[PDB]
């Protein structure tokens, strides 16, 4: 806390509830007990419990439900920490807000007693800051790729941990971003371009550094100096348990793209993303000049 | 030798003179011996010896010339085995044929006593099956590159050493392609063709096979290193004639011969043939890949800003 003397004082305070975000087990504890919130909220919408149960709890009714239904209901939902996706047994779940509210788990951006709003289309459901779309490749095999707003994706890359920072270190960080985009957002035209361009502007010997995301689902697989296609085939095909046929893909030209309209309707492929993409080689060249006398390869040209 | 009964006999023959071409020191001896032949031809043309000396030789006359000029005449010539380039003190050398014919070193494709024709442009002098041209790069540094008939170089690459599997024949081709990138990068057709071969043969297939028989072959291309990287190594880093050692970053910055020279050394540059070949060349590359299977390929053709 800032002091009234031109400096800074450090307060020592205590309290009982809430979670320290840094605890070694925040993710697991916030995960387990959010499983429990949603298991409960399912129960209310299903008729297992009512508001009456806040006072007189009908425990054998909930014990019966766990016994006859627990393992089934557990598979109806995806729970990562404090984020979930629930597929309840019917749409009564949208009004089940007692207990959700009594347990203090207020819903963001909605009236306390206002019905929740659901999605019929799995591709429109948000999870872990992403939507997920299904892509078919040229060889008929299908992928389900994660998607996120381009501008939010780039904006985080376009910001730096601080000054006193070298040109080599700021290059290395940019590699990590670009190489990650190549793993997970290759299906976006602009990101594919910008990712390859970064990879073309940064030395091939320079190992990436830094954190590109905090997600507990980031493979981390991109902070290598292996061929990015080589890792792409590994994670999307060889080690993908959902991939029956493991024929490797030979060139970026074969890795698919979102349907054009989803790309433009998900934040630039616009008059200005023609000038940009046309003259992006100029940009790479500038960056290589800043970096100086190192070993660059040209990955943008394997895009034609 | 074929026998008169459907099979083959081996004769055993003998003789004294002539050089066995596959002796351990044929190159050295032929160089030393041919140095001597040219040094004598120099003497005849300068006037130190004449046809008289074939009978009663004026030995003190030749030994003075060696004492007084030998070292200098030595630096006036390039001699590699039986090939020379000679730059005599004046063109009397043309007519100086007596001791050359007497020593049996009969010139190819010219009358025995017909004057030798010379060249004032070094870029026209043939040596070791090549000519040499000077190129200036985009950055102002000069290269002097070995050139050769394009059809002669592709044609040797089209000859297979049978029993060579699709992999062994792919590897032999990479050898030719890699070599073309070291020495004939300045030929449009060959850069294209060598870049295509490297895009059609697996990354980690080490090249194998004889690409040239010259003893000026680096063999520096029988690596699986990056071909640009070896280019900078030989043309810049290790090149003793490059004062500045700034490496070049992309093939777009490695020069070409002037287009006139390209066509003139038998380039296809111009015809609908070469034009349409260049267009449809990726189709060829993909066939070779499909022919070869599920291996790791990379795309070097496109790094021609294409
Ligand atoms: Zn999307
Ligand atoms: Zn030439």
Coordinates of C-alpha atoms and ligand atoms in Angstrom, one line a residue:
Chain A
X1 CA 0.0 0.0 0.0
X2 CA 1.5 3.4 -0.9
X3 CA 2.6 5.4 2.1
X4 CA 2.0 9.1 2.7
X5 CA 5.8 9.8 2.7
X6 CA 6.8 9.2 -0.9
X7 CA 7.4 5.4 -0.5
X8 CA 5.5 2.2 0.2
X9 CA 4.4 0.2 3.3
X10 CA 3.5 -3.5 3.5
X11 CA 0.4 -4.5 5.4
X12 CA 0.1 -7.8 7.2
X13 CA -3.6 -8.9 7.2
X14 CA -5.6 -12.1 8.0
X15 CA -8.9 -13.7 7.0
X16 CA -10.6 -17.1 7.0
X17 CA -12.3 -18.0 3.7
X18 CA -11.5 -17.5 0.0
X19 CA -8.7 -19.3 -1.9
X20 CA -5.1 -18.2 -2.3
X21 CA -4.7 -18.3 -6.0
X22 CA -1.0 -19.5 -5.7
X23 CA -1.6 -22.5 -3.5
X24 CA 0.0 -25.7 -4.8
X25 CA -3.5 -27.2 -5.1
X26 CA -5.8 -24.3 -6.2
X27 CA -6.5 -25.9 -9.5
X28 CA -7.4 -29.3 -8.0
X29 CA -9.4 -28.0 -5.2
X30 CA -11.2 -25.4 -7.2
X31 CA -11.8 -28.2 -9.7
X32 CA -13.2 -30.9 -7.3
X33 CA -15.4 -28.4 -5.5
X34 CA -16.8 -26.9 -8.7
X35 CA -17.6 -30.4 -9.8
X36 CA -19.7 -30.5 -6.5
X37 CA -21.5 -27.2 -7.2
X38 CA -22.6 -28.3 -10.6
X39 CA -23.5 -31.8 -9.4
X40 CA -25.7 -29.9 -6.9
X41 CA -27.1 -27.5 -9.4
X42 CA -28.0 -30.5 -11.6
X43 CA -29.9 -32.0 -8.6
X44 CA -32.0 -28.8 -8.1
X45 CA -33.1 -28.6 -11.7
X46 CA -33.9 -32.3 -11.8
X47 CA -36.3 -32.1 -8.8
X48 CA -34.0 -33.9 -6.4
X49 CA -33.8 -30.9 -4.2
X50 CA -35.9 -27.7 -3.7
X51 CA -35.4 -24.5 -1.8
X52 CA -37.1 -26.2 1.1
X53 CA -34.0 -28.4 1.5
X54 CA -31.9 -25.4 2.6
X55 CA -33.6 -25.8 6.0
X56 CA -34.9 -29.4 6.0
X57 CA -32.4 -31.4 3.8
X58 CA -33.8 -34.5 2.2
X59 CA -30.4 -36.2 2.4
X60 CA -31.6 -39.7 1.4
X61 CA -33.0 -38.2 -1.7
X62 CA -29.6 -36.8 -2.7
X63 CA -27.9 -40.0 -1.6
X64 CA -30.2 -42.0 -3.8
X65 CA -29.4 -39.7 -6.7
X66 CA -25.7 -40.1 -6.3
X67 CA -26.1 -43.8 -6.0
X68 CA -28.4 -44.3 -9.0
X69 CA -27.0 -41.5 -11.2
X70 CA -23.7 -40.1 -9.9
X71 CA -21.3 -41.8 -12.4
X72 CA -23.6 -41.0 -15.3
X73 CA -24.0 -37.3 -14.3
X74 CA -20.2 -37.0 -13.8
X75 CA -19.7 -37.6 -17.5
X76 CA -22.2 -35.0 -18.5
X77 CA -19.9 -32.1 -17.8
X78 CA -16.3 -30.8 -18.3
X79 CA -14.8 -29.1 -15.3
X80 CA -11.5 -27.3 -15.3
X81 CA -11.0 -25.3 -12.2
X82 CA -13.7 -22.7 -12.0
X83 CA -14.8 -23.2 -15.6
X84 CA -17.4 -25.8 -16.7
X85 CA -19.6 -27.1 -19.5
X86 CA -22.7 -28.9 -18.3
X87 CA -25.0 -31.0 -20.5
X88 CA -28.0 -31.5 -18.1
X89 CA -30.7 -34.1 -18.6
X90 CA -33.1 -31.4 -19.7
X91 CA -33.5 -27.7 -19.8
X92 CA -34.8 -27.3 -16.3
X93 CA -31.2 -26.6 -15.4
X94 CA -31.5 -23.1 -16.7
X95 CA -33.8 -22.0 -13.8
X96 CA -32.0 -24.0 -11.1
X97 CA -30.5 -20.9 -9.4
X98 CA -31.2 -21.4 -5.7
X99 CA -28.2 -23.1 -4.0
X100 CA -26.1 -22.0 -6.9
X101 CA -26.9 -18.6 -5.4
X102 CA -27.0 -19.8 -1.8
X103 CA -23.5 -21.3 -2.2
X104 CA -22.4 -17.8 -3.3
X105 CA -21.4 -19.0 -6.8
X106 CA -22.9 -15.9 -8.5
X107 CA -23.0 -16.0 -12.3
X108 CA -21.1 -13.4 -14.3
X109 CA -23.0 -10.9 -16.4
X110 CA -26.6 -12.0 -15.6
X111 CA -29.3 -11.1 -13.0
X112 CA -29.1 -13.2 -9.9
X113 CA -32.4 -14.9 -10.6
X114 CA -32.4 -14.6 -14.4
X115 CA -32.5 -17.8 -16.3
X116 CA -29.2 -19.1 -17.7
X117 CA -28.8 -19.1 -21.4
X118 CA -27.8 -22.3 -23.1
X119 CA -26.5 -23.5 -26.5
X120 CA -27.9 -26.1 -28.8
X121 CA -24.7 -26.2 -30.9
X122 CA -21.6 -27.7 -29.3
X123 CA -19.4 -25.6 -31.6
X124 CA -20.8 -22.4 -30.0
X125 CA -20.0 -23.4 -26.4
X126 CA -17.1 -21.6 -24.6
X127 CA -14.6 -23.5 -22.6
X128 CA -11.2 -22.4 -21.3
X129 CA -11.4 -19.1 -23.4
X130 CA -12.0 -21.0 -26.6
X131 CA -14.7 -22.2 -29.0
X132 CA -14.1 -25.4 -30.8
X133 CA -14.8 -26.0 -34.5
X134 CA -14.7 -29.2 -36.6
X135 CA -12.4 -29.1 -39.7
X136 CA -12.1 -31.8 -42.4
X137 CA -8.8 -32.1 -44.1
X138 CA -8.1 -32.7 -47.8
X139 CA -7.5 -36.4 -47.1
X140 CA -10.9 -36.7 -45.4
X141 CA -9.7 -36.9 -41.8
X142 CA -11.3 -34.6 -39.3
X143 CA -9.9 -32.3 -36.6
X144 CA -11.5 -30.3 -33.9
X145 CA -9.4 -27.2 -33.5
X146 CA -9.5 -24.6 -30.7
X147 CA -10.4 -21.0 -31.6
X148 CA -10.1 -17.7 -29.8
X149 CA -10.4 -14.1 -30.8
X150 CA -7.5 -13.2 -33.1
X151 CA -7.2 -9.7 -31.6
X152 CA -7.1 -11.0 -28.1
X153 CA -4.6 -13.6 -29.2
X154 CA -2.3 -11.1 -30.9
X155 CA -2.7 -8.3 -28.3
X156 CA -1.3 -10.5 -25.6
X157 CA 1.7 -11.4 -27.8
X158 CA 2.2 -7.7 -28.7
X159 CA 2.9 -6.9 -24.9
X160 CA 6.2 -7.4 -23.1
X161 CA 7.1 -8.2 -19.5
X162 CA 9.2 -5.1 -19.2
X163 CA 12.0 -2.7 -20.2
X164 CA 15.7 -3.5 -19.5
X165 CA 15.0 -6.2 -22.1
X166 CA 17.3 -7.1 -24.9
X167 CA 16.5 -7.5 -28.6
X168 CA 17.5 -11.1 -28.5
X169 CA 15.2 -11.8 -25.5
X170 CA 12.3 -9.9 -27.1
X171 CA 12.8 -11.9 -30.3
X172 CA 12.8 -15.2 -28.4
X173 CA 9.5 -14.4 -26.8
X174 CA 8.0 -13.6 -30.1
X175 CA 9.1 -17.0 -31.4
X176 CA 7.2 -18.7 -28.6
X177 CA 4.0 -16.8 -29.4
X178 CA 4.3 -17.5 -33.2
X179 CA 5.2 -21.1 -32.8
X180 CA 2.2 -21.6 -30.4
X181 CA -0.1 -20.0 -32.9
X182 CA 1.2 -22.5 -35.5
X183 CA 0.3 -25.4 -33.2
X184 CA -3.2 -24.3 -32.2
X185 CA -4.5 -21.5 -34.5
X186 CA -3.0 -22.6 -37.8
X187 CA -6.6 -22.7 -39.1
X188 CA -6.7 -18.9 -38.9
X189 CA -5.4 -17.3 -42.1
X190 CA -3.8 -14.2 -40.5
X191 CA -2.3 -16.1 -37.6
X192 CA -0.8 -18.7 -39.9
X193 CA 0.8 -15.8 -41.8
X194 CA 2.0 -13.9 -38.8
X195 CA 3.2 -17.0 -37.2
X196 CA 5.3 -18.1 -40.1
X197 CA 6.6 -14.5 -40.6
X198 CA 7.8 -14.4 -37.0
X199 CA 9.5 -17.7 -37.5
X200 CA 11.1 -16.3 -40.6
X201 CA 12.4 -13.2 -38.7
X202 CA 13.9 -14.9 -35.7
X203 CA 17.1 -17.0 -35.8
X204 CA 16.8 -20.8 -36.1
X205 CA 19.2 -21.4 -33.3
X206 CA 17.3 -19.2 -30.8
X207 CA 15.3 -21.3 -28.5
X208 CA 12.0 -19.7 -27.4
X209 CA 11.5 -18.4 -23.8
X210 CA 8.8 -17.0 -21.6
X211 CA 5.1 -17.7 -21.0
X212 CA 2.7 -17.5 -23.9
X213 CA -0.4 -18.5 -21.8
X214 CA -1.3 -19.5 -18.3
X215 CA -3.8 -22.3 -19.3
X216 CA -3.5 -25.6 -17.5
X217 CA -4.1 -27.0 -21.0
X218 CA -1.2 -25.5 -22.9
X219 CA 0.9 -28.4 -24.2
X220 CA 3.9 -26.1 -24.0
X221 CA 5.0 -28.2 -27.0
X222 CA 5.9 -25.1 -29.1
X223 CA 8.9 -23.9 -27.1
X224 CA 11.2 -26.1 -29.1
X225 CA 13.5 -25.5 -32.0
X226 CA 12.2 -28.6 -33.8
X227 CA 10.5 -28.2 -37.1
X228 CA 7.0 -26.8 -36.3
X229 CA 5.4 -29.1 -38.9
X230 CA 7.2 -31.9 -37.2
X231 CA 5.6 -31.1 -33.9
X232 CA 2.2 -30.4 -35.5
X233 CA 2.1 -33.9 -37.0
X234 CA 3.1 -35.3 -33.6
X235 CA 0.4 -33.5 -31.6
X236 CA -2.4 -33.5 -34.2
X237 CA -1.8 -37.0 -35.7
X238 CA 0.7 -39.3 -34.1
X239 CA -0.1 -38.7 -30.4
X240 CA -3.7 -37.8 -31.1
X241 CA -5.8 -40.6 -29.7
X242 CA -8.8 -39.4 -31.7
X243 CA -6.8 -40.0 -35.0
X244 CA -7.2 -43.5 -36.4
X245 CA -5.0 -43.1 -39.5
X246 CA -1.5 -41.8 -38.8
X247 CA -0.3 -40.8 -42.3
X248 CA 1.8 -37.7 -41.6
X249 CA 1.1 -34.5 -43.4
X250 CA 3.9 -33.3 -45.6
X251 CA 3.5 -29.5 -45.9
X252 CA 1.7 -26.6 -44.4
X253 CA -0.2 -26.3 -47.7
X254 CA -2.2 -29.4 -46.6
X255 CA -3.2 -28.2 -43.1
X256 CA -6.7 -26.8 -43.4
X257 CA -8.3 -23.4 -42.7
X258 CA -11.5 -22.4 -40.9
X259 CA -14.3 -21.8 -43.4
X260 CA -13.5 -18.3 -44.8
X261 CA -16.6 -16.7 -43.1
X262 CA -15.9 -18.1 -39.7
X263 CA -12.3 -16.6 -40.0
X264 CA -13.6 -13.1 -40.8
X265 CA -16.5 -13.6 -38.3
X266 CA -14.1 -14.3 -35.4
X267 CA -12.1 -11.0 -35.6
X268 CA -8.9 -9.3 -40.8
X269 CA -8.8 -11.5 -44.0
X270 CA -10.7 -6.1 -44.9
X271 CA -8.7 -3.9 -47.3
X272 CA -5.8 -3.5 -44.9
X273 CA -5.0 -7.1 -44.4
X274 CA -4.2 -7.1 -48.1
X275 CA -1.6 -4.3 -47.8
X276 CA -0.2 -6.0 -44.6
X277 CA 0.0 -9.6 -46.0
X278 CA 1.3 -8.3 -49.4
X279 CA 4.2 -6.4 -47.8
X280 CA 4.9 -8.5 -44.8
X281 CA 8.3 -9.6 -46.2
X282 CA 9.5 -6.1 -45.7
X283 CA 8.7 -6.5 -42.1
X284 CA 10.6 -9.7 -41.7
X285 CA 13.6 -8.1 -43.4
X286 CA 13.6 -5.2 -41.0
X287 CA 13.5 -7.5 -38.0
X288 CA 16.3 -9.6 -39.3
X289 CA 18.4 -6.4 -39.7
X290 CA 17.7 -5.5 -36.1
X291 CA 18.8 -9.0 -35.0
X292 CA 21.8 -9.0 -37.3
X293 CA 24.0 -11.7 -38.6
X294 CA 22.3 -15.0 -37.8
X295 CA 20.9 -18.0 -39.5
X296 CA 17.4 -17.3 -40.8
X297 CA 15.2 -19.5 -42.9
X298 CA 12.1 -18.5 -45.0
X299 CA 8.9 -20.2 -43.8
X300 CA 6.5 -17.7 -45.4
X301 CA 7.2 -18.9 -48.9
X302 CA 6.0 -22.4 -48.2
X303 CA 2.5 -20.8 -48.1
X304 CA 1.8 -20.6 -51.9
Chain B
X1 CA 37.8 -60.1 -75.4
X2 CA 34.9 -62.1 -76.8
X3 CA 35.6 -65.8 -77.4
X4 CA 34.4 -67.7 -80.5
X5 CA 32.3 -70.1 -78.3
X6 CA 29.7 -67.8 -76.6
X7 CA 31.7 -66.7 -73.6
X8 CA 34.6 -64.4 -72.7
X9 CA 38.3 -64.8 -72.7
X10 CA 40.9 -62.6 -70.9
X11 CA 44.1 -61.8 -72.7
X12 CA 47.4 -61.1 -70.9
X13 CA 49.4 -58.4 -72.8
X14 CA 52.6 -56.4 -72.1
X15 CA 54.3 -53.3 -73.2
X16 CA 56.8 -50.7 -72.1
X17 CA 55.6 -47.1 -72.7
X18 CA 52.2 -45.3 -72.1
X19 CA 50.6 -44.4 -68.8
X20 CA 48.2 -46.7 -67.0
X21 CA 45.4 -44.3 -66.2
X22 CA 44.6 -45.9 -62.8
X23 CA 48.1 -45.8 -61.3
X24 CA 48.2 -44.3 -57.8
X25 CA 50.2 -41.3 -59.1
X26 CA 49.0 -40.7 -62.6
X27 CA 47.7 -37.2 -61.8
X28 CA 51.0 -36.1 -60.2
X29 CA 53.3 -37.6 -62.8
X30 CA 51.2 -36.3 -65.7
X31 CA 51.3 -32.9 -64.1
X32 CA 55.0 -32.8 -63.7
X33 CA 55.6 -34.4 -67.1
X34 CA 53.2 -31.9 -68.8
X35 CA 54.8 -29.0 -67.0
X36 CA 58.1 -30.1 -68.6
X37 CA 56.5 -30.3 -72.0
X38 CA 55.1 -26.8 -71.8
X39 CA 58.3 -25.4 -70.3
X40 CA 60.1 -26.8 -73.4
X41 CA 57.5 -25.4 -75.8
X42 CA 58.1 -22.0 -74.1
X43 CA 61.8 -22.3 -74.8
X44 CA 61.4 -23.1 -78.5
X45 CA 59.1 -20.2 -79.0
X46 CA 61.3 -17.7 -77.2
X47 CA 64.3 -18.9 -79.3
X48 CA 66.3 -20.7 -76.6
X49 CA 66.1 -23.9 -78.7
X50 CA 65.4 -24.7 -82.3
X51 CA 65.1 -27.7 -84.6
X52 CA 68.9 -27.9 -84.8
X53 CA 69.0 -28.9 -81.1
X54 CA 67.1 -32.1 -81.8
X55 CA 70.5 -33.3 -83.3
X56 CA 73.3 -31.7 -81.3
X57 CA 71.7 -29.8 -78.4
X58 CA 72.9 -26.6 -76.9
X59 CA 72.5 -27.8 -73.3
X60 CA 74.2 -24.8 -71.6
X61 CA 71.6 -22.6 -73.4
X62 CA 68.6 -24.4 -71.8
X63 CA 70.3 -24.5 -68.3
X64 CA 70.9 -20.7 -68.4
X65 CA 67.2 -20.1 -69.3
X66 CA 66.1 -22.2 -66.3
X67 CA 68.5 -20.5 -64.0
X68 CA 67.4 -17.1 -65.2
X69 CA 63.7 -17.5 -66.1
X70 CA 62.4 -20.9 -65.0
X71 CA 60.7 -19.7 -61.8
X72 CA 59.0 -17.0 -63.6
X73 CA 57.8 -19.2 -66.5
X74 CA 56.4 -21.6 -63.9
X75 CA 54.0 -19.0 -62.7
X76 CA 52.8 -18.3 -66.2
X77 CA 50.8 -21.5 -66.5
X78 CA 48.1 -23.6 -64.8
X79 CA 48.7 -27.3 -65.3
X80 CA 46.4 -30.0 -64.0
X81 CA 47.3 -33.4 -65.3
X82 CA 47.2 -33.3 -69.0
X83 CA 45.3 -30.0 -69.2
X84 CA 47.1 -26.7 -69.3
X85 CA 46.5 -23.0 -69.6
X86 CA 49.7 -21.3 -70.7
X87 CA 50.4 -17.5 -71.0
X88 CA 53.7 -17.2 -72.9
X89 CA 55.8 -14.1 -73.1
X90 CA 54.6 -13.6 -76.7
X91 CA 52.6 -15.4 -79.3
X92 CA 55.6 -17.0 -81.1
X93 CA 54.4 -19.9 -78.9
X94 CA 51.7 -20.5 -81.6
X95 CA 54.2 -21.5 -84.2
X96 CA 56.5 -23.3 -81.8
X97 CA 55.5 -26.9 -82.7
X98 CA 58.8 -28.7 -83.4
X99 CA 59.6 -30.1 -80.0
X100 CA 56.0 -30.5 -79.2
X101 CA 55.4 -32.8 -82.1
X102 CA 58.8 -34.4 -81.6
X103 CA 57.9 -35.3 -78.0
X104 CA 54.6 -36.9 -79.4
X105 CA 52.3 -34.5 -77.6
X106 CA 50.2 -34.2 -80.8
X107 CA 47.5 -31.5 -80.3
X108 CA 43.8 -32.4 -80.6
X109 CA 41.7 -31.3 -83.6
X110 CA 44.2 -29.3 -85.5
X111 CA 46.8 -29.9 -88.3
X112 CA 50.1 -31.3 -87.0
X113 CA 51.9 -28.1 -88.2
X114 CA 49.0 -25.7 -88.0
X115 CA 49.5 -22.7 -85.7
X116 CA 47.9 -22.9 -82.3
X117 CA 45.0 -20.4 -81.8
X118 CA 44.9 -18.4 -78.6
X119 CA 42.5 -16.2 -76.6
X120 CA 42.8 -12.7 -75.2
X121 CA 39.8 -13.0 -72.9
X122 CA 40.5 -15.2 -69.9
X123 CA 36.7 -15.8 -69.6
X124 CA 37.0 -17.8 -72.8
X125 CA 39.9 -20.0 -71.9
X126 CA 38.9 -23.6 -71.2
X127 CA 40.3 -25.5 -68.3
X128 CA 39.3 -28.7 -66.6
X129 CA 36.2 -28.9 -68.7
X130 CA 35.0 -25.5 -67.7
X131 CA 35.1 -21.8 -68.5
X132 CA 35.1 -19.2 -65.7
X133 CA 32.9 -16.1 -65.6
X134 CA 33.0 -13.2 -63.2
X135 CA 29.8 -12.3 -61.3
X136 CA 29.2 -9.4 -59.1
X137 CA 26.7 -10.0 -56.3
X138 CA 24.0 -7.7 -55.1
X139 CA 26.3 -6.4 -52.3
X140 CA 29.2 -5.6 -54.7
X141 CA 31.4 -8.6 -54.0
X142 CA 32.8 -10.5 -57.0
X143 CA 32.5 -14.2 -57.6
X144 CA 34.3 -16.1 -60.3
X145 CA 32.2 -19.1 -61.1
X146 CA 32.9 -22.4 -63.0
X147 CA 30.6 -22.9 -66.0
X148 CA 29.9 -25.8 -68.3
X149 CA 27.4 -27.0 -70.9
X150 CA 24.1 -27.3 -69.2
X151 CA 23.1 -30.3 -71.5
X152 CA 26.4 -32.0 -70.6
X153 CA 25.7 -31.8 -66.9
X154 CA 22.1 -32.9 -66.9
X155 CA 23.0 -35.7 -69.3
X156 CA 25.5 -37.3 -67.0
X157 CA 22.9 -37.1 -64.2
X158 CA 20.4 -38.9 -66.3
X159 CA 22.7 -42.0 -66.5
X160 CA 22.2 -44.6 -63.9
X161 CA 25.3 -46.6 -62.6
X162 CA 20.6 -51.7 -62.7
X163 CA 19.8 -53.2 -59.3
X164 CA 19.6 -49.6 -58.0
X165 CA 16.5 -49.3 -55.8
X166 CA 14.3 -46.2 -55.8
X167 CA 16.1 -45.0 -52.7
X168 CA 19.6 -45.5 -54.0
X169 CA 18.7 -43.7 -57.2
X170 CA 17.1 -40.9 -55.3
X171 CA 20.3 -40.5 -53.3
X172 CA 22.4 -40.4 -56.4
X173 CA 20.3 -37.6 -57.7
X174 CA 20.5 -35.5 -54.6
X175 CA 24.3 -35.8 -55.1
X176 CA 24.0 -34.2 -58.5
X177 CA 21.5 -31.6 -57.3
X178 CA 23.6 -30.6 -54.3
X179 CA 26.6 -30.3 -56.5
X180 CA 24.8 -28.1 -59.0
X181 CA 23.9 -25.8 -56.2
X182 CA 27.6 -25.4 -55.2
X183 CA 29.0 -24.7 -58.6
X184 CA 26.3 -23.9 -61.1
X185 CA 23.9 -22.0 -59.0
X186 CA 24.4 -19.2 -61.6
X187 CA 22.5 -21.2 -64.2
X188 CA 18.7 -20.6 -63.9
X189 CA 17.8 -24.0 -65.3
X190 CA 20.2 -25.8 -62.9
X191 CA 19.3 -23.9 -59.7
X192 CA 15.7 -24.7 -60.4
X193 CA 16.4 -28.3 -61.2
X194 CA 18.7 -28.8 -58.2
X195 CA 16.3 -27.1 -55.8
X196 CA 13.5 -29.4 -57.2
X197 CA 15.6 -32.5 -56.7
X198 CA 16.3 -31.5 -53.1
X199 CA 12.6 -30.9 -52.6
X200 CA 11.8 -34.3 -53.9
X201 CA 14.4 -36.4 -52.0
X202 CA 14.1 -37.0 -48.2
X203 CA 15.8 -34.5 -45.9
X204 CA 18.0 -37.1 -44.1
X205 CA 18.9 -39.2 -47.1
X206 CA 22.6 -38.6 -47.2
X207 CA 23.7 -38.4 -50.8
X208 CA 25.9 -41.2 -52.4
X209 CA 27.6 -41.8 -55.7
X210 CA 30.1 -40.3 -58.2
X211 CA 29.0 -37.0 -59.6
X212 CA 32.4 -35.9 -61.1
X213 CA 35.8 -37.5 -61.9
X214 CA 37.8 -34.2 -61.7
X215 CA 40.3 -34.0 -58.9
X216 CA 39.0 -30.5 -58.3
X217 CA 35.7 -31.9 -57.0
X218 CA 35.2 -30.6 -53.4
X219 CA 32.7 -33.3 -52.8
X220 CA 31.5 -30.7 -50.3
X221 CA 27.9 -31.4 -51.4
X222 CA 27.8 -35.0 -50.2
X223 CA 26.6 -33.7 -46.9
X224 CA 23.1 -33.4 -45.5
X225 CA 23.8 -29.9 -44.3
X226 CA 21.9 -27.0 -45.6
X227 CA 23.0 -26.2 -49.2
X228 CA 23.0 -22.4 -48.6
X229 CA 25.1 -23.0 -45.5
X230 CA 27.7 -24.9 -47.5
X231 CA 27.6 -22.2 -50.2
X232 CA 28.6 -19.5 -47.6
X233 CA 31.2 -21.9 -46.3
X234 CA 33.0 -22.4 -49.7
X235 CA 32.2 -19.1 -51.5
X236 CA 32.7 -16.7 -48.6
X237 CA 33.9 -18.1 -45.2
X238 CA 36.6 -20.4 -46.6
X239 CA 37.1 -18.6 -49.9
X240 CA 40.6 -17.0 -49.6
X241 CA 39.7 -14.4 -52.2
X242 CA 36.8 -13.0 -50.2
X243 CA 38.1 -10.2 -48.0
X244 CA 34.6 -9.4 -46.5
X245 CA 33.0 -12.4 -44.8
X246 CA 29.4 -11.3 -44.5
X247 CA 27.2 -14.4 -45.1
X248 CA 24.4 -14.3 -47.5
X249 CA 20.9 -15.2 -46.1
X250 CA 18.7 -16.4 -49.0
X251 CA 19.1 -17.9 -52.5
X252 CA 17.4 -14.8 -53.9
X253 CA 20.7 -13.0 -53.1
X254 CA 23.0 -15.4 -54.9
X255 CA 23.7 -14.1 -58.5
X256 CA 23.0 -15.6 -61.9
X257 CA 24.9 -15.4 -65.1
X258 CA 23.7 -12.7 -67.4
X259 CA 20.7 -14.2 -69.3
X260 CA 22.5 -13.9 -72.6
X261 CA 25.3 -16.2 -71.3
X262 CA 22.7 -18.6 -69.8
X263 CA 21.0 -19.2 -73.2
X264 CA 24.4 -19.3 -75.0
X265 CA 25.9 -22.1 -72.8
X266 CA 22.9 -24.1 -74.0
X267 CA 20.2 -23.0 -71.6
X268 CA 16.5 -23.8 -72.2
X269 CA 15.7 -20.3 -70.9
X270 CA 13.5 -18.8 -73.6
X271 CA 11.6 -21.7 -75.1
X272 CA 8.0 -22.7 -74.4
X273 CA 9.7 -25.9 -73.3
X274 CA 11.7 -24.4 -70.4
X275 CA 8.9 -22.0 -69.6
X276 CA 6.3 -24.8 -69.3
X277 CA 8.7 -27.1 -67.6
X278 CA 9.4 -24.5 -64.9
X279 CA 5.6 -24.0 -64.4
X280 CA 4.7 -27.7 -64.0
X281 CA 7.7 -28.7 -62.1
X282 CA 6.1 -29.2 -58.7
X283 CA 3.8 -31.8 -60.3
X284 CA 7.1 -33.7 -61.0
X285 CA 8.3 -33.2 -57.5
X286 CA 5.1 -34.6 -56.0
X287 CA 5.3 -37.7 -58.2
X288 CA 8.8 -38.4 -56.9
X289 CA 7.6 -38.0 -53.3
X290 CA 4.7 -40.3 -53.8
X291 CA 7.1 -42.7 -55.5
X292 CA 9.3 -42.6 -52.4
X293 CA 6.7 -42.8 -49.7
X294 CA 6.1 -41.4 -46.2
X295 CA 9.3 -39.6 -45.6
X296 CA 10.3 -36.1 -44.4
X297 CA 10.4 -33.7 -47.3
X298 CA 11.1 -29.9 -47.2
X299 CA 10.2 -27.2 -49.7
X300 CA 13.3 -25.5 -51.3
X301 CA 11.8 -24.7 -54.7
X302 CA 9.5 -22.0 -53.2
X303 CA 12.3 -20.1 -51.7
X304 CA 12.9 -18.7 -55.1
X305 CA 10.2 -16.0 -54.1
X306 CA 7.8 -18.4 -55.8
Ligands
LIG1 ZN1 -13.7 -19.7 -34.1
LIG2 ZN1 29.5 -20.6 -69.3

